[PDB]
Amino acid sequence: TPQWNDWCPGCGNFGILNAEQQAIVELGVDTKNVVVVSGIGCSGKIPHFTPISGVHTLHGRAIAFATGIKLSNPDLVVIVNGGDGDLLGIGAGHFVAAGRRNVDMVVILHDNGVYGLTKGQASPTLKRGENINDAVNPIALAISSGYTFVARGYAYDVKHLKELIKSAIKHKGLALIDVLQPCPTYNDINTKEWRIYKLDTLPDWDPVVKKPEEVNEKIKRAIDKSLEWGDIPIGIFYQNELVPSYEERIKANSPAYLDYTPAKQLIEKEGKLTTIIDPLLKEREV
Amino acid sequence: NFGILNAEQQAIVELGVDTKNVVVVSGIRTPISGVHTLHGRAIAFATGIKLSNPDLVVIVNGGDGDLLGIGAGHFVAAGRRNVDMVVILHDNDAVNPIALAISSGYTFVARGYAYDVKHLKELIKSAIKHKGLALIDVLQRIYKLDTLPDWDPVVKKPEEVNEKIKRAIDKSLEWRIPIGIFYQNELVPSYEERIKANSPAYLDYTPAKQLIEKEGKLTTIIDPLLKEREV
Amino acid sequence: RLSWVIGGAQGTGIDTAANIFGNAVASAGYYIYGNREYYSNGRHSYFSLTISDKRVRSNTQKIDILVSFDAETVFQHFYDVKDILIYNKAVETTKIELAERIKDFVKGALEYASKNVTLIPVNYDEIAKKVADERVKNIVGITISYKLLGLDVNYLIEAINSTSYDIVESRYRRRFWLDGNTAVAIGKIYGGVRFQSYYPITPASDESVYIEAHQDVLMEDPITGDKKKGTIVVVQAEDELAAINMAIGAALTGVRAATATSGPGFSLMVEGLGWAGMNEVPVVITYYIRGGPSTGLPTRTAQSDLIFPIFAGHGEFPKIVLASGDHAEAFKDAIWALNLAEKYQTPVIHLVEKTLANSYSTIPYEELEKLKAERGKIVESGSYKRFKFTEDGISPRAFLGKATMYYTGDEHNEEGHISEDVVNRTMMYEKRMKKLEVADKEIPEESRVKIYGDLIITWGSPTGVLRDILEESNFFTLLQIRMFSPFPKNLVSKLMEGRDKIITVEGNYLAQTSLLVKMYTGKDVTNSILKWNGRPFLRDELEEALIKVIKDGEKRVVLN
Amino acid sequence: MRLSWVIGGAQGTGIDTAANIFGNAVASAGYYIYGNREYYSNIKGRHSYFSLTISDKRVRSNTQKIDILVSFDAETVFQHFYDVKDILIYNKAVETTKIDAVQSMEPELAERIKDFLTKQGYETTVKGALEYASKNNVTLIPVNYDEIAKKVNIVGITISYKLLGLDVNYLIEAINSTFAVKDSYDIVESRYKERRRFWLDGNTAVAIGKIYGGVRFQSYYPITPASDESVYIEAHQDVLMEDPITGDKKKGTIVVVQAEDELAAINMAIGAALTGVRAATATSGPGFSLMVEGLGWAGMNEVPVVITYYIRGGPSTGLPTRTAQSDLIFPIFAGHGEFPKIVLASGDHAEAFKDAIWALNLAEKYQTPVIHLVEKTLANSYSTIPYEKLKAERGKIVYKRFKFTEDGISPRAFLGKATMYYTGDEHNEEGHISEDVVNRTMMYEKRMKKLEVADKEIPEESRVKIYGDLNSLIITWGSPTGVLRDILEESFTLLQIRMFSPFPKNLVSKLMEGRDKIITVEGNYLAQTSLLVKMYTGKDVTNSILKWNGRPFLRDELEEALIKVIKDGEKRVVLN
Ligand SMILES: CC/C(O)=C1\SC(CCOP(=O)(O)OP(=O)(O)O)=C(C)N1Cc1cnc(C)nc1N
Ligand code: SF4
Ligand SMILES: [Mg+2]
């Protein structure tokens, strides 16, 4: 069990870590099947955990690693943690491509404003003027990419974060939770201190698609809400379970897929290859 | 293909740009120079060309798979810098270039049909002329936003951006298929302009024109750099 | 040994024509080695095959029979033609960079061929009008040249139906049609690959396209005989970075995962390769060597990429590298590569020249056939430490879902946690490197090398050309290196020990194989035969250059 | 007379400034310094230390053994107690602390110190370590930084400064020109100019080298050893240029771009170079692995570009903050398809500065990428450098961009100043795509000929350095060179390879010809330099001294390995 946590005193990650552990306990998932896949950075050092498996990746590549794990063994429950530099700079391509695919997994973004572990350079979420580059809009990009469950949360409201994380896992398809995490060591602005309100408050807020005719209308409401910043919403901006996951699209093609997954197939018995090649070779006889 | 290329020559001619300062960068004439780059990397190359010599006019030509597949990280990164150049896009699921371009934003975003070539040519002239990073998605039901009641995609006051973004995004979900300019916001400074504000000499003596050497002798002076390091 | 070429414009049934000819001639009982040459598109291509009594593993520059329907093909090939030249009469009076050089080197070209080639004009346009009311040049065509061979039309009608004659007069075991892509595809399927990810790239897409077409797979049991239905997941990644990273992800699960790329692509996978090496992950990359650098010659071949793949990646880590020489080996090596990956818990690069990918041949079944599985040091469960310190460097391998484990690209302790501890780093780095030393004692040197006759040192496709040069002329020991890491240094050195001429043959400017040979043995080669023009080695051209090396003592022969 | 000083501390707690103050003041009094920072891939909480050598004579390295340990906490004591030889300054207010108490220390380290101390055997407290120190002749000095903190970092360095017996008026200046001494000065008593000199680390030497060398476009992705090089360049991006024949000053700008990834970074710089600008990037192992595709295109289209490659611990993420010499064969043969690359490696701070300029000149002359290897030790080590007449070689500048010549080098025009075609696809003299067999053979040859020409025009003597002279040769490159030159001042021929491509074949054969003992010394496992030496010369090294533990070679440890090779033997000595 021993492994020491070297986050700075005060770091939004302590919160993400806590919400995520709690998310899994409460959800009654077999921890034997949980795998947390993380990119590079401060955020990448989770775990740090409870006996969960952890795959610490390459910078920007978590989503590609996570997709291979998931399609080989769809029983697993794959969570991805990455930094802002990670998922939206160097890994932005993997980020957009993943929404085309709709794999059942959770992507959790550590919205830091900075390259923390590399000594504080502006991340792709830092606004110009804080810095010569604009910030991207994570939630809007996810919706465009896109991306069948989307949400924002705050690392200093573990309660709310834990419930986002839970419904993201329950969600069948690719979820994104964008988490605002302060960095007392390198983000002088966006302290905490630094405003937040919850969408779930608003009188008639309904982010779930019930029928496919209300797709565009739910998108448009999610984009409007993604534009507020300065004096900041939080919660589930959009959700749509009518879109089939990638694993459902493999079945509509390969019925035996979900019954006999790649991770369970026995290619060998006592070092003897079990796969039948004979029609492949027969179709090529002279 | 033949038509998209043609429409680029003619916009260049019609805006009166000097052909010796045009570079066309693409993935995998007259006297226009061409740079055939690596797969999905044209924008990074273009960025480098344009920032060393801002007097050049840099057009990026790419395929749907080139940008927005392999190049999709360069695509969104470019939207953060707002470099004065133009990206012409020659159009499991598929992605929405317009929405991704506005969400990553991308300060001129448009759609043309591959013929109307007239209309495309006027879009290309708008893009070049536009101060910042323009994208034209080109398709190869259709109607022109240009011909609606009060369609004005241009932001002219800081308070209009939200309303302009919301309308562009709505129109980018229509599929009635809109073509034209969805969004133009020249209140966002160019990347070159942002360099100027910190390094004021940049435009009037550019990195490409700087003489770093006279007959084998290095003309830079480092003495003040070496003085701050003295024991 | 006869040498046949058909040529013309792309998408003009010249491929099906070639297919049929080759089916016909092969089902009679002869052997074929075929290969196609083409540009990146309209343009001109041709198919060159050699027909022979015994196994044939090469082509020739020179052409015995040339079938041609346009002026282009005559112009392209007339200089190489030796015996028969079938041509279209309708193009007899057609005028012309390749073209510039041909302006001094159609009538004029036949003028040249006469002085000395038998010259068969054909009323192609006329023959086709006589099929009416009853792209047909192609069939006669293959018919004229087929009766030339003096084989019974019964076999060539057979071939046409499973998809003129008398114009001219006659002049002259279980087996499989395999190309390199197909042979690898079928190796991987048989070898147990249940996850292939890839990005489309010219020589390598065909392999994954075949695997996806045959993803619906059937597995038996030797005991019960109970057959079970399986599925190979094939993902088209967004880029080559995604491709390896998916494969590596999938391998942590226990599945045999692979990918296939070519040069541009491999350069993008170097980061992933390093993670797999750091984390002791089995994964194989099929590396199709094509003309480089950079984009290079996408439709052409080379042997340019050898030292790079052996030494790719930015620290030190074990990787196994394996090089196929013919179509049968391509099928064997795919399976050997998987097993090696799993036994030594490390990435394996399987090198395959582009020449072998697209070229095809008639392969006799006894290849073979015996192929087993080795899953290495693998546990079901599940206190377990993934990277347990072990004498042979190979830690017992549990799979995701079966044990609590930690993987990381940072240096790590036995748990897989991050450690910057000086003692752990020394021990843990050594452990990964030991596995290569263990592979060197445990893989017999004689398996990493193939020896014919009894010095020419080579690898890959020129090996088959050099074997075909061990009947014609009274000629050497032929040493094919098969595994470059761990390199068989003691055996290669011993084999280099008692001779006057040591020649190296390879498709490189730098003669990389000599560089490697020298690095591990200290011994130099006496001569080198090189080529880098994007074209395979040819039987005749290589014969003549070998003479230059042996007669005139020429140190470095370049094949233009 | 060389003196070993160490100050330790938790990452984030003061430090840096404490070592840079002490270091400045000792240097201002005309003494020479070589200082090195050892720290974790961490921002706050882990143990860092600064090792400095003090000397009357130029110095190039550090030792395992310490003569003065300054410690303010308890972790420092445990981390180092074993290595102290003379004085150990400690905080008395943490004399009671157990090992089990110390949360920061990697558990694997904590065990070793626990037993040690149990065998021996003392308490497994700080006291226990301090008490071990005493029975190995270490003079303890108790300190009450608490008592002083309320009766009023600096106190620690001030005590150790008094131990030297130098003038307090440098410490002061050192403390004034940067931002107590009255008290701490008087608790223990003493126990022990010529030319301009500059403080440099490898990063700053390269950055200043690039600024002076004409670099006006630099792209980078943040990565630990090399984001400091850019940043420094960005901070001084507004630069002055003057020629003699007019005298006129003219102000310029170095564009520094923080790219989205390393692919982008190399691709922007290549892009910049077509324009005629001198362009460069800076990276480390993970980033270089991503740049290989770009290097290929630059090789193919004969584009000058320099990549500064800092070598950190690998493979993969590896040891982000630690050094190695692991990356030699890889950069030399990086890329598919064969193309000229020039590869250069610095062995000290001054050479870092000069090679950066040389690399720019070679890029431009042979129209090809140039990789400049700098170990991460050089980047984080710093030293007092004396005056170490340096020119520009813009090569063959002025239409067919790839016109054939016999030396392989085509006259170069820039974008804007001529109509040009560039492509990654094989191409003819105009730069258009050409699969033609004769063009192919000729064009591939022409690129490759450039390197044969470099092989002739660069003398072999400028590609190496030679020190000492004897019957027992040592071959090395990079930072151990400095360590071995310091060893030559107290009781062999030392050959330092500088350029590995084109490699100085014949000079190395020649120089190996009459010896009993040939020893490679390098921070890697495979002994990569020996493999290169054997590749090019056919000859073998007799022995190796190797180290792969993330730590630089140290003066005392490498001296004990030499003896153990030379007097004694053993083929292969692994440093601990
Ligand atoms: C182990 C520490 C290390 O080497 C790091 S950490 C790091 C962090 C980037 O910040 P982020 O926003 O993704 O994470 P944060 O630290 O949580 O802000 C980078 C870019 N790197 C460097 C790096 C750069 N490029 C590649 C390809 N790989 C890398 N590891
Ligand atoms: S740096 Fe910012 S992010 Fe990295 S640990 Fe210290 S605080 Fe948390
Ligand atoms: Mg971050």
- Contact residues for B163 (Cβ-Cβ < 8 A; gap 6+): none
Please list, residue by residue across B60-85, b when 16 or more beta carbons sit within 10 angstroms of its beta carbon and e when fewer do: bbbbeebbbbbbbbbbbbbbbbbbbb
- Contact residues for D242 (Cβ-Cβ < 8 A; gap 6+): B219, B221, D248, D249, D250
| Residue D225 CB less than 6 A away from ligand 1 | no
SS (H, E, C) C303-359: CCCCHHHHHCCCCCCCCEEEECCCHHHHHHHHHHHHHHHHHHCCEEEEEEEHHHHHC
Centroid of chain to Cα D299: 26
Instruction: Please name the residues between 257 and 316 in chain D that touch chain A, using a CB distance below 8 Å.
Output: 258, 260-262, 286, 316
CB contact at 8 A, D317 and A58:
yes
Closest CA to A41 of A143, A108, A99, A112: A112
Q: Which H helix or E strand runs over C193?
A: strand C193-198
CB contact at 8 A, D572 and D543:
yes
Residue A6 covered by a domain? no
Residue A258 covered by a domain? yes
For residues A110 and A87, give the distance between their C-alpha atoms in angstroms, rounded to a whole number: 9
Closest CA to C507 of C260, C354, C341, C304: C304
CA angle D419, D425, D426 (to 5 degrees): 90
CB contact at 8 A, D544 and D571:
yes
Looking up tokens 């022995």 gives D543
Distance (Å) of CA D201 to CA D211, D389, D498: 15, 21, 19
- Contact residues for C108 (Cβ-Cβ < 8 A; gap 6+): none
- Contact residues for D221 (Cβ-Cβ < 8 A; gap 6+): A90, D258, D259, D260, D261, D262, D264, D265, D283, D287
For residues D370 and A260, give the distance between their C-alpha atoms in angstroms, rounded to a whole number: 52
Q: Which H helix or E strand runs over A14?
A: helix A12-27
Cα dihedral sign for B83, B86, B89, B95?
positive
CB contact at 8 A, C237 and C201:
no
**CA of D331 to nearest chain B CA: how many angstroms apart?**
20
D220 contact residues in A (CB cutoff 8 A): none
Structure determination method: X-ray
- Contact residues for C306 (Cβ-Cβ < 8 A; gap 6+): C351, C459, C484, C508, C512, C513, C516
Q: Flag whether A43 is marked binding.
A: yes
For residues C306 and C326, give the distance between their C-alpha atoms in angstroms, rounded to a whole number: 17
For residues A261 and B201, give the distance between their C-alpha atoms in angstroms, rounded to a whole number: 63
Looking up tokens 């360069």 gives B74
| Residue A186 CB less than 6 A away from ligand 1 | no
| Residue A117 CB less than 6 A away from ligand 2 | yes
Q: Which residues share a beta bridge with B141?
A: none
Residue A2 covered by a domain? no
| Residue A183 CB less than 6 A away from ligand 2 | yes
Residue D336, phi then psi, degrees to nearest 5: -80, 150
Tokens representing C407?
A: 């993987």
For residues C307 and C296, give the distance between their C-alpha atoms in angstroms, rounded to a whole number: 18
CA angle C356, C358, C361 (to 5 degrees): 70
Query: In this structure, which ligand is nearest to the CA of A41?
Result: 1
Distance B136 CA to ligand 1 centre (A): 33
Q: Whose CA is nearest to atom 6 of ligand 2?
A: A8
Tokens representing A138?
A: 């994570």
Distance (Å) of CA C269 to CA B71, C69, C312, D293, D573: 16, 45, 10, 10, 34
- Contact residues for D278 (Cβ-Cβ < 8 A; gap 6+): B212, D213, D214, D215, D216, D217, D304, D306, D360, D363, D364
Closest CA to D322 of D372, D285, D282, D376: D376
CB contact at 8 A, D403 and D411:
yes
Residue D374, phi then psi, degrees to nearest 5: -130, 120
For residues A165 and A169, give the distance between their C-alpha atoms in angstroms, rounded to a whole number: 6
Tokens representing C486?
A: 């761990």
CB contact at 8 A, C79 and C94:
no
In the three-class reduction of DSSP (H, G, I as helix; E, B as strand; rest coil), residue D307 is classed as strand
Amino acid at D140: L
Tokens representing D559?
A: 């001296």
Beta-strand runs (E) in C227-319: 228-231, 233-236, 256-262, 283-291, 297-301
CB contact at 8 A, D309 and D371:
yes
**CA of D442 to nearest chain C CA: how many angstroms apart?**
9
SS (H, E, C) D261-297: CHHHHHHHHHHHHHCCCEEEEEEEHHHHHHHHHHHHH
In the three-class reduction of DSSP (H, G, I as helix; E, B as strand; rest coil), residue D546 is classed as strand
Distance A29 CA to ligand 1 centre (A): 31
Distance (Å) of CA D261 to CA C191, D257, D267: 37, 11, 10
For residues D80 and D102, give the distance between their C-alpha atoms in angstroms, rounded to a whole number: 15
Cα dihedral sign for D525, C520, D516, D471?
negative
Residue A256 covered by a domain? yes
Using CA atoms in the order A185, A187, A193, A198, what is the torsion angle rounded to 10 degrees?
-120
CB-nearest to D27 from B32, B195, B231 is B231
CB contact at 8 A, D473 and D512:
yes
| Residue D223 CB less than 6 A away from ligand 1 | yes
CB contact at 8 A, C542 and C466:
yes
Contact C267 D335 (CB under 8 A): yes
| Residue D142 CB less than 6 A away from ligand 1 | no
Query: In this structure, which ligand is nearest to the CA of A12?
Result: 2
Closest CA to C197 of C141, C151, C253, C259: C259
Centroid of chain to Cα C236: 22
For residues D283 and D327, give the distance between their C-alpha atoms in angstroms, rounded to a whole number: 13
Residue A4 covered by a domain? no
Q: Flag whether B28 is marked binding.
A: yes
Contacting chains of C (3 CB pairs or more, <8 Å) are: A, B, D
Q: Find out whether the peptide bond into A47 is cis, omega within 30 degrees of 0.
A: yes
Q: Which residues share a beta bridge with C165?
A: none
Structural domain of A218: 11-274
Contacting chains of A (3 CB pairs or more, <8 Å) are: B, C, D
The number of folded domains in chain A is 1
In the three-class reduction of DSSP (H, G, I as helix; E, B as strand; rest coil), residue C285 is classed as strand
Looking up tokens 């090198």 gives C351
In the three-class reduction of DSSP (H, G, I as helix; E, B as strand; rest coil), residue D309 is classed as strand
The residue of chain D nearest to residue A123, with distances taken between CA atoms, is: D260
CB contact at 8 A, C156 and A232:
no
Distance B77 CA to ligand 2 centre (A): 24
Closest CA to B77 of A94, A133, C237: A133
CB-nearest to A121 from D107, D227, D286 is D227
Residue B98, phi then psi, degrees to nearest 5: -60, -50
Q: Which residues share a beta bridge with D10?
A: D47
For residues B48 and B44, give the distance between their C-alpha atoms in angstroms, rounded to a whole number: 6
Distance A109 CA to ligand 3 centre (A): 9
DSSP state of D355: H
Q: What is the DSSP string of B186-217?
A: TTSPPHHHHHHHHSTTTTTS-TTT---EETTE
Residue A284 covered by a domain? no
For residues D229 and D380, give the distance between their C-alpha atoms in angstroms, rounded to a whole number: 11
Closest CA to D368 of D429, D259, D310, D446: D446
Instruction: Please name the residues between 7 and 46 in chain B that touch chain D, using a CB distance below 8 Å.
Output: 20-21, 23, 28, 31-38, 41, 44-46
For residues C89 and D309, give the distance between their C-alpha atoms in angstroms, rounded to a whole number: 64
